[PDB]
Amino acid sequence: MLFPDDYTKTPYIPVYASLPMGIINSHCQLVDPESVRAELRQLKSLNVDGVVVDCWWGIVEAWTPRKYEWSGYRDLFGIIKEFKLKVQVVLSFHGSGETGSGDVLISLPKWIMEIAKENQDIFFTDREGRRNTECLSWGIDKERVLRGRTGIEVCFDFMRSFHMEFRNLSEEGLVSSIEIGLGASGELRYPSCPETMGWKYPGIGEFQCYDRYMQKNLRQSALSRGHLFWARGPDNAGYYNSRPHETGFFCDGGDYDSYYGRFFLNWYSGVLMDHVDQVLSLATLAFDGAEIVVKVPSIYWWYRTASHAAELTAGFYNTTNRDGYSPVFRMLKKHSVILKLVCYGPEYTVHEKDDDEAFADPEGLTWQVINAAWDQGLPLCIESALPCRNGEAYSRILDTAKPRDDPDRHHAASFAYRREACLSELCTFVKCMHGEAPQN
């Protein structure tokens, strides 16, 4: 058949399915409950264990600070409960569309966009002055610029509101975990590859450290090193679609490995680490007893180079001489969080046919990140695009969730994915993920 489907006597790994992006409208109303029941019926027919519910900041705290609207999500959680499904909750502090249009448009809160009109520096900013309007810059974590609150306080207040509204669901076992959606796409990363600004694979992306608050942080860090001239972002790093060889920062023997470059990359990746460190401490406070999940991206292009430029601009200081994931994962381990790794996403042939000559290694990056996490004792969740009729794509997910090469039988804690042709194969895949004999 399509793929070898004999995973019997392997652990039962629960499967979670995403829901339609526009399931709840901009006024936080369930658009069509009966349509939700229809989709949940089909998911149970497949033996899917649960659903991913994305709770959008722009829908819940839409109109004015400190006022939260949850009724649509209450209604949705009620329906899911009727179907005896589990819920992976995702708190999205970002808009949609960092990668492209998508089904619906979900923006940041209207009151945030109003603030932005007078203070564009609340957004991640690139060297050319373009603002990323998909999420708030980490530079305002401690800056009381959001109508009397800081970036951290707004995120904390939102989390506390979810727990006040929905503490029962976790106690009941309905909600399996709560994912903190950190960056412009919910993944732990700088927004270094914005589609709206023209990034196309395999562009190295750009450093996002040019808003005035991050620049002030960078200036203080440089002065404390004794180097006033280090208070700068790299000027020889090229552009969103550059290749590393054609840049002075990222090329072999380039400035990424100088005293300045090492200082800047340590500062840049350290700001990312500090942001997540502070948010997770408060997420543990807001959701006492809940499993917390953070999502990391698979930035595998230019992985087969010295400087790993695409990881660098995304904020992971991972080079041929430096492990950029283990420091992050040590910090995650101290918060007892689960790592969700985006694996084998859509449009994977950006390297099957390496027409772009991207020096990429998706499999190698995946297993560096997985092994780095298991070295930490970090539990691992997998998220992947679901194929329809590619057996090799199905086996790749299964052989990543159930590694086989590991002695301790390190399986993924869960798998999440975002015509009865695809349905039949998907049904076989779920039985494989459950460790069951596949027939019928």
Automatic annotation (TrEMBL):
Signal sequence region: none
Q: In the UniProt record, does the keyword Amino-acid biosynthesis occur?
A: no
Task: Give the highest taxon in the source lineage.
Answer: Eukaryota
Q: Name one GO biological process term.
A: regulation of DNA-templated transcription
Disulfide bond entries = 388-422
Q: Where is the active site?
A: 187 (proton donor), 383 (proton acceptor)
Any one GO molecular-function label of the UniProt entry: beta-amylase activity
Note whether Hydrolase occurs among the keywords: yes
**Entry's EC annotation:** 3.2.1.2
Keyword field: Carbohydrate metabolism, Glycosidase, Hydrolase, Polysaccharide degradation
Q: Which reaction does it catalyse?
A: Hydrolysis of (1->4)-alpha-D-glucosidic linkages in polysaccharides so as to remove successive maltose units from the non-reducing ends of the chains
Q: Which family does it belong to?
A: Belongs to the glycosyl hydrolase 14 family.
Q: This protein is called what?
A: Beta-amylase
Q: Which organism is it from?
A: Zea mays (Maize)
